[PDB]
């Protein structure tokens, strides 16, 4: 996250950290939608062009954290992965379309002041909030420059008109994604913040909703491009099948 700021403790309790067991490194971001299910971008678990194909054992998730490095004692909860689920029509060859996937935690996690699930949008909220000019929020432990972040970083980004997205990009942005970012303030999702949640606070009920997923944060601020985010609503359908079929 570039040009962002340090988050306040408990500011984003649905924030999750995808962690590689060995090597011991930070993979991606993720979000708690339930006490048993974690959401994230697909290109975090699978991406042949780089030889990424994690099994449900190559990693584990850390919930409730603030600090990137330290093991926050009595705060963060270590959670294992039962079964990963990548979306079938996930094209990486083409444009990271349908860049999304679910992970079921081995055991239910207990919610605390620093661990609470986020809300998945519905057509109503989705249709009234997703609008050009309308801001959302991005969090993650991604790079600071274009630098490592001591703690979770946070940045609010304005959505951009679909006409100004497809244009500035020589990529094929599908219906299952949208782009956000200021036009040439700077600040955006940098690599590593991927899988993180893109959220908005509904004025109809005061609850935070995850409108999208971080799939291609606009480089790292440099004027010209906008980050590509998964359209969580346009894919909520798949999400439920997976959770429903359990």
């Amino acid at each position: 996250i570039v040009e962002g700021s340090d988050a306040e403790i408990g500011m984003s309790p649905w924030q999750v950290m995808l962690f590689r067991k060995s090597p011991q490194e930070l993979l991606c971001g993720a979000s708690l939608i339930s006490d048993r299910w974690v959401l994230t971008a697909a290109h975090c678990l699978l991406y042949p062009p780089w030889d990424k194909n994690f099994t449900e054992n190559d990693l584990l998730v850390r919930i409730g954290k603030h600090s990137r490095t330290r093991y926050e004692r009595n705060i963060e909860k270590i959670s294992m992965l039962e079964k990963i689920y990548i979306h079938p029509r996930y094209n990486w060859r083409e444009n990271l379309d349908r860049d999304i996937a679910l992970m079921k935690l081995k055991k239910p996690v207990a919610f605390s002041d620093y661990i609470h699930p986020v809300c998945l949008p519905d057509r109503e909220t989705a249709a009234s909030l997703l609008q050009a000019g309308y801001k959302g929020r991005v969090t993650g432990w991604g790079n600071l420059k274009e630098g490592q972040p001591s703690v979770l970083q946070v940045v609010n980004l304005p959505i951009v008109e679909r006409p100004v997205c497809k244009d500035s990009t020589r990529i094929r942005i599908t219906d299952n994604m949208f782009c956000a970012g200021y036009k040439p303030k700077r600040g955006d999702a940098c690599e590593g913040d991927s899988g993180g949640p893109f959220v908005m606070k509904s004025p109809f009920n005061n609850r935070w909703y995850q409108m999208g997923i971080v799939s291609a944060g606009a480089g790292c601020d440099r004027d010209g491009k906008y980050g590509f985010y998964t359209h969580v609503f346009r894919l909520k359908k798949w999400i439920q099948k997976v959770i429903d079929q359990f």
Binding site: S5, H116, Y134, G136, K201, W208
Partner: peptide, 28 residues
């Protein structure tokens, strides 16, 4: 699903340092 409400903020009638900034973008 009591989701979407933050224990240390909503649940205590407290706002975070920059959430108003989002509302404003909504209310134009």
């Amino acid at each position: 699903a009591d989701c979407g409400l933050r224990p240390l903020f909503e649940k205590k009638s407290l706002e975070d340092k920059t959430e108003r900034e989002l509302l404003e973008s909504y209310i134009d």
